[PDB]
Design an enzyme around this catalytic site. Structure first.
Site, PDB file in Angstrom:
ATOM      1  N   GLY A  16       0.795  -1.195   0.000  1.00 22.29           N
ATOM      2  CA  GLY A  16       0.000   0.000   0.000  1.00 22.29           C
ATOM      3  C   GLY A  16       0.833   1.251   0.000  1.00 22.29           C
ATOM      4  CE  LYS A  17      -1.076   8.106  -1.484  1.00 25.79           C
ATOM      5  NZ  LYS A  17      -2.023   8.233  -0.325  1.00 25.79           N
ATOM      6  N   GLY A  18       1.701   4.600   2.120  1.00 26.34           N
ATOM      7  CA  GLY A  18       1.779   5.105   3.453  1.00 26.34           C
ATOM      8  C   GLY A  18       2.366   6.489   3.344  1.00 26.34           C
ATOM      9  CB  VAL A  23       4.733   0.017   2.093  1.00 25.14           C
ATOM     10  CG1 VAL A  23       5.398  -1.054   2.929  1.00 25.14           C
ATOM     11  CG2 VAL A  23       4.754   1.344   2.810  1.00 25.14           C
ATOM     12  CG  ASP A 132       3.143  13.312  11.228  1.00 20.54           C
ATOM     13  OD1 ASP A 132       2.688  14.446  11.524  1.00 20.54           O
ATOM     14  OD2 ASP A 132       4.143  13.173  10.494  1.00 20.54           O
ATOM     15  CE  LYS A 134      -1.778   9.554   9.414  1.00 20.47           C
ATOM     16  NZ  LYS A 134      -0.332   9.743   9.690  1.00 20.47           N
ATOM     17  CG  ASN A 137       1.198   6.197  11.428  1.00 16.97           C
ATOM     18  OD1 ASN A 137       1.362   5.751  10.322  1.00 16.97           O
ATOM     19  ND2 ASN A 137       1.263   7.458  11.685  1.00 16.97           N
ATOM     20  CG  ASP A 153       5.184   5.981   8.971  1.00 16.32           C
ATOM     21  OD1 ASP A 153       5.900   5.061   8.474  1.00 16.32           O
ATOM     22  OD2 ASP A 153       4.237   6.533   8.323  1.00 16.32           O
ATOM     23  CB  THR A 172      -3.216  14.567   8.951  1.00 14.04           C
ATOM     24  OG1 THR A 172      -3.748  15.484   7.998  1.00 14.04           O
ATOM     25  CG2 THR A 172      -2.482  13.487   8.182  1.00 14.04           C
ATOM     26  CD  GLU A 373      -4.718  -4.962 -31.285  1.00 14.50           C
ATOM     27  OE1 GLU A 373      -4.472  -6.142 -30.971  1.00 14.50           O
ATOM     28  OE2 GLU A 373      -4.996  -4.644 -32.459  1.00 14.50           O
ATOM     29  CE  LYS A 404     -30.788   4.718  -5.869  1.00  6.29           C
ATOM     30  NZ  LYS A 404     -31.439   3.401  -6.132  1.00  6.29           N
ATOM     31  CG  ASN A 434     -36.125  11.192 -11.124  1.00  5.09           C
ATOM     32  OD1 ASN A 434     -37.035  11.677 -11.831  1.00  5.09           O
ATOM     33  ND2 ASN A 434     -36.351  10.211 -10.238  1.00  5.09           N
ATOM     34  CG  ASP A 436     -33.718   9.901  -7.850  1.00  4.10           C
ATOM     35  OD1 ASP A 436     -34.954  10.029  -8.048  1.00  4.10           O
ATOM     36  OD2 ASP A 436     -32.915   9.434  -8.700  1.00  4.10           O
TER      37      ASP A 436
HETATM   38  C1  LIG Z   1      11.292   5.049  10.771  1.00  2.00           C
HETATM   39  C2  LIG Z   1       9.996   4.323  10.412  1.00  2.00           C
HETATM   40  O1  LIG Z   1       9.793   4.444   8.999  1.00  2.00           O
HETATM   41  C3  LIG Z   1       9.442   3.319   8.308  1.00  2.00           C
HETATM   42  C4  LIG Z   1      10.445   2.518   7.762  1.00  2.00           C
HETATM   43  C5  LIG Z   1      10.135   1.352   7.153  1.00  2.00           C
HETATM   44  C6  LIG Z   1       8.799   0.944   7.020  1.00  2.00           C
HETATM   45  C7  LIG Z   1       8.455  -0.251   6.379  1.00  2.00           C
HETATM   46  C8  LIG Z   1       7.154  -0.635   6.263  1.00  2.00           C
HETATM   47  C9  LIG Z   1       6.123   0.147   6.776  1.00  2.00           C
HETATM   48  C10 LIG Z   1       4.739  -0.374   6.729  1.00  2.00           C
HETATM   49  N1  LIG Z   1       3.780   0.284   6.097  1.00  2.00           N
HETATM   50  N2  LIG Z   1       2.792  -0.655   5.887  1.00  2.00           N
HETATM   51  C11 LIG Z   1       1.772  -0.422   4.886  1.00  2.00           C
HETATM   52  C12 LIG Z   1       0.630   0.453   5.194  1.00  2.00           C
HETATM   53  C13 LIG Z   1      -0.542   0.124   4.263  1.00  2.00           C
HETATM   54  C14 LIG Z   1      -1.803   0.815   4.720  1.00  2.00           C
HETATM   55  N3  LIG Z   1      -1.672   1.806   5.801  1.00  2.00           N
HETATM   56  C15 LIG Z   1      -0.947   1.217   6.932  1.00  2.00           C
HETATM   57  C16 LIG Z   1       0.203   0.270   6.643  1.00  2.00           C
HETATM   58  C17 LIG Z   1       3.116  -1.833   6.460  1.00  2.00           C
HETATM   59  N4  LIG Z   1       2.366  -2.945   6.498  1.00  2.00           N
HETATM   60  C18 LIG Z   1       2.957  -3.923   7.178  1.00  2.00           C
HETATM   61  N5  LIG Z   1       4.153  -3.921   7.775  1.00  2.00           N
HETATM   62  C19 LIG Z   1       4.909  -2.808   7.700  1.00  2.00           C
HETATM   63  N6  LIG Z   1       6.098  -2.806   8.298  1.00  2.00           N
HETATM   64  C20 LIG Z   1       4.385  -1.684   7.020  1.00  2.00           C
HETATM   65  C21 LIG Z   1       6.416   1.349   7.377  1.00  2.00           C
HETATM   66  C22 LIG Z   1       7.763   1.776   7.527  1.00  2.00           C
HETATM   67  C23 LIG Z   1       8.118   2.964   8.205  1.00  2.00           C
END
Ligand SMILES: CCOc1ccc2ccc(-c3nn(CC4CCNCC4)c4ncnc(N)c34)cc2c1
Length: 454
Positions: A16-18, A23, A132, A134, A137, A153, A172, A373, A404, A434, A436
Site C-alpha cells: 500500500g501507500k503510506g 510500501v 503524526d 494516528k 500508524n 513511522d 491527519t 493494443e 444508494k 430526477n 432523487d
Molecule cells: C522510521 C519508520 O519508517 C518506516 C520505515 C520502514 C517501514 C516499512 C514498512 C512500513 C509499513 N507500512 N505498511 C503499509 C501500510 C498500508 C496501509 N496503511 C498502513 C500500513 C506496512 N504494512 C505492514 N508492515 C509494515 N512494516 C508496514 C512502514 C515503515 C516505516
C-alpha cells in the site's frame, strides 16, 4: 562498495501507500527473509535535515527495540530513492479490526492505550518524537485476537516534509497537537494525539470535528471539547480524567507519556464492565466514511495518472516504430515500458529490469505485436485495482445494502475529501436530474470522473 537494494531484495507485491511513499512486501534473495520496504522518492519528498543528520538517526533507529514499535532492519539510498526495510506485520490497521468485533469495553481500550503509551515512553527516552501519530500508524502484529500493536513511522516526520496533497492528508487533522500547528513543539505532542485516539475509542467520535480540514484545524487550535454526548454517560470518571490531562492545552502542563502509564484508569482497567455498543457503531461509521473518501481520492488520482501514462507510452512506441508498421517486438515493448518508468516516477512495484520483463509478459499473455493494443491492456492493469477498491469501499459504506448513498452522506464524504460543496453539487446536478437526492454506485463513479476532468 556502496550496496544496492535490488542486489539483496526482490519485490513480492505492493502492500500500500503510506506516509512519504509506497510500501512493498520484499524478500531477501539469499535467506528468504520477508520484509516490508518503504520506498521514498526524492523527487516527491523533500528532506528537512542534512544527510549527516538522517544517517545518524537511521543508525540509532536500527538499534532501538521495543515490542510496540516497528523494527527497522536496513537503510539503502541511490540516485532517486531511499529504501527503509522493516519487519512485516499482517494484522492490518487497528480500527479495521475493532469494527469487526461485537463487543468493546473500557478494558479493551485500556489495554490498547497502555501499549501505545509504552512505545511512546520508550521512544521519548531515546529523544525521538512521532508527531503524526494516528490510527493508520497502529498496526496489529498478526491476525490473532490478542496480538500486539506496532507503531509505524516513528522519526520520519523530523527528516521529511509531508505531502500537501489531500489524498495523502486524509485523517491527519483530527490528531495533530495545537502547538505543532504554530511551530513550537516537543515530545508532548505525542501525548495529545494519543488522547484524541483514546477519546475516539470510548465515544466513536473525534473530540475536534468539522465539515472540512480547515474547520477541524480551527477546533483543535482553540482546544475546547466536551463530554456531553450521551455515550459518555456509560464511561468511568477515571477515563475522562486521563483524557483531560492528555488534552491539556499548554504542553508543559500536559501529562507525560510515562506518568499516563501510571494513571489510575490504566492501572484499574488493565488488571462488571459493559460493552460500549454505541461507540462501536460510531467507529464503524467513522471508519467507513474515511475509507470511502480515501478511495474516491485514489481513484481520481489513478485516472489522471493513466491519462498521463497512456499518451506518454504511445509516443515512446510511435517514436520506436522505425518501420511505421504499428508493430514492435517484445524487447522493444520492454525498452519502451522501461523508458516510461524512467521519465515517470510511480512504480516502486517495478524495482528492477526483471520486474518489468514479468509485467510485460503478463500483459502479453493476456493479449511482432500491435503496440496500440498492448497500451490498452497495460494501463487498465494499474487502475482497476483502484476501480475495484472504489466499489469495495462504496459497498462497505452502504451498510444497509440499499444500493444508494444519500445527499447528506455525499456532503460528509466530499467534506472529508475536501471537494468543494458547490462543485460536487454542480457535478451531481448534471448526473441526478430526477432530484432523487441519492446516487447508486455507477452515478457516484460518474461524478468522480467529472471531478477529475472527465
Ligand atoms: C522510521 C519508520 O519508517 C518506516 C520505515 C520502514 C517501514 C516499512 C514498512 C512500513 C509499513 N507500512 N505498511 C503499509 C501500510 C498500508 C496501509 N496503511 C498502513 C500500513 C506496512 N504494512 C505492514 N508492515 C509494515 N512494516 C508496514 C512502514 C515503515 C516505516
Amino acid at each position: 562498495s556502496t550496496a544496492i537494494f535490488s542486489d539483496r531484495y526482490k519485490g513480492q507485491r505492493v502492500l500500500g501507500k503510506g506516509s512519504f511513499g509506497e510500501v512493498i512486501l520484499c524478500k531477501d534473495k539469499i535467506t528468504g527473509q520477508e520484509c516490508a520496504v518503504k520506498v521514498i522518492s526524492k523527487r516527491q519528498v523533500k528532506q528537512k535535515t542534512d544527510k549527516e543528520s538522517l544517517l545518524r538517526e537511521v543508525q540509532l533507529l536500527k538499534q532501538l527495540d521495543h515490542p510496540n514499535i516497528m523494527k527497522l532492519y536496513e537503510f539503502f539510498e541511490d540516485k532517486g530513492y531511499f529504501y527503509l526495510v522493516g519487519e512485516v506485520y499482517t494484522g492490518g490497521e487497528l480500527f479495521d479490526e475493532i469494527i469487526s468485533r461485537k463487543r468493546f469495553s473500557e478494558v479493551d481500550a485500556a489495554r490498547i492505550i497502555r501499549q501505545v503509551l509504552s512505545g511512546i515512553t520508550y521512544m521519548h527516552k531515546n529523544k525521538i518524537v512521532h508527531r503524526d501519530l494516528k490510527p493508520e500508524n497502529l498496526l496489529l502484529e498478526s491476525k490473532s485476537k490478542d496480538a500486539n500493536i506496532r507503531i509505524i513511522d516513528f522519526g520520519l516526520s523530523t527528516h521529511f516534509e509531508a505531502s500537501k496533497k489531500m489524498k495523502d492528508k486524509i485523517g491527519t487533522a483530527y490528531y495533530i497537537a495545537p502547538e505543532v500547528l504554530h511551530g513550537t513543539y516537543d515530545e508532548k505532542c505525542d501525548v495529545w494525539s494519543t488522547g484524541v485516539i483514546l477519546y475516539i475509542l470510548l465515544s466513536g467520535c473525534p473530540p475536534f470535528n468539522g465539515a472540512n480540514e480547515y474547520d477541524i484545524l480551527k477546533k483543535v487550535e482553540k482546544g475546547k471539547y466536551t463530554f456531553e454526548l450521551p455515550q459518555w454517560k456509560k464511561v468511568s470518571e477515571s477515563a475522562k480524567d486521563l483524557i483531560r490531562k492528555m488534552l491539556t492545552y499548554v504542553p508543559s502542563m500536559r501529562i507525560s507519556a510515562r506518568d499516563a502509564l501510571d494513571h489510575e484508569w490504566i492501572q484499574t482497567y488493565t488488571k462488571d464492565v459493559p460493552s460500549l455498543d454505541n461507540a462501536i457503531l460510531n467507529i464503524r461509521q467513522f471508519q467507513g466514511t474515511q475509507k470511502l473518501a480515501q478511495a474516491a481520492l485514489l481513484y481520481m488520482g489513478s485516472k489522471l495518472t493513466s491519462q498521463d501514462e497512456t499518451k506518454e507510452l504511445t509516443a515512446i512506441f510511435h517514436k520506436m516504430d522505425k518501420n511505421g508498421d504499428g508493430q514492435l517486438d517484445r524487447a522493444e515493448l520492454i525498452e519502451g515500458y522501461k523508458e516510461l518508468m524512467r521519465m515517470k516516477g510511480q512504480d516502486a512495484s517495478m524495482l528492477d529490469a526483471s520486474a518489468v520483463e514479468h509485467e510485460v509478459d503478463q500483459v502479453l499473455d493476456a493479449v511482432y505485436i500491435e503496440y496500440s493494443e498492448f497500451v490498452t491492456v497495460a494501463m487498465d492493469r494499474k487502475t482497476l485495482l483502484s476501480r475495484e477498491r472504489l466499489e469495495r469501499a462504496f459497498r462497505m459504506f452502504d451498510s444497509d445494502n440499499s444500493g444508494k448513498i444519500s445527499s447528506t452522506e455525499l456532503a460528509t464524504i466530499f467534506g472529508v475529501s475536501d471537494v468543494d460543496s458547490e462543485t460536487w453539487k454542480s457535478v451531481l446536478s448534471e448526473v441526478d436530474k430526477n432530484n432523487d437526492g441519492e446516487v447508486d454506485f455507477d452515478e457516484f463513479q460518474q461524478m468522480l470522473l467529472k471531478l477529475c476532468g472527465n
